């Protein structure tokens, strides 16, 4: 299988947005360079939530486009 650079850019943008959201939520910046145990747990949870959210939002956009076409 092969993937496109546009897809890579979209994935990178989604990852950047998810990382920004996770940092803002879990307050990852308030650390001395190492995330606490709670910080890492919150980071993992927020990353899973953001990945699910990205999948859901992409599916919603695709479904809206399909319903427009279909």
Partner 1 sequence: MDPVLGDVIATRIYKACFKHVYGKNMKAYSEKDEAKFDQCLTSYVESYKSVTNHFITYLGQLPKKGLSLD
The one among 16, 56, 59, 62 contacting partner 1 by CB under 8 A:
16
CB of 48 to partner 1, least distance (A): 5
Question: What gap in Å lies between CA 46 and CA 26, rounded to an integer?
Answer: 8
Q: Cβ distance 51 to 21 under 8 Å? A: no
DSSP 3-19: --HHHHHHHHHHHHHHH
Position 37 contacts partner 1 (CB under 8 A)? no
DSSP state of 28: T
The verdict on 52 binding partner 1 (CB under 8 A) reads: yes
Judged by the rule CB under 8 A, the positions of this chain that interact with partner 1 are: 5, 8-9, 12-13, 15-16, 18-20, 22-23, 28-35, 40, 43-44, 46-48, 50-52, 54-55
């Amino acid at each position: 299988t092969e993937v496109s650079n546009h897809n890579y850019t979209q994935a990178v943008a989604y990852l950047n947005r998810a990382t920004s959201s996770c940092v803002k939520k879990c307050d990852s910046l308030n650390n001395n360079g190492s995330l606490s145990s709670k910080q890492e747990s919150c980071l993992k949870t927020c990353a899973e939530n953001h990945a699910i959210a990205t999948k859901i939002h992409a599916e919603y956009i695709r479904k809206l486009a399909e319903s427009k076409y279909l």
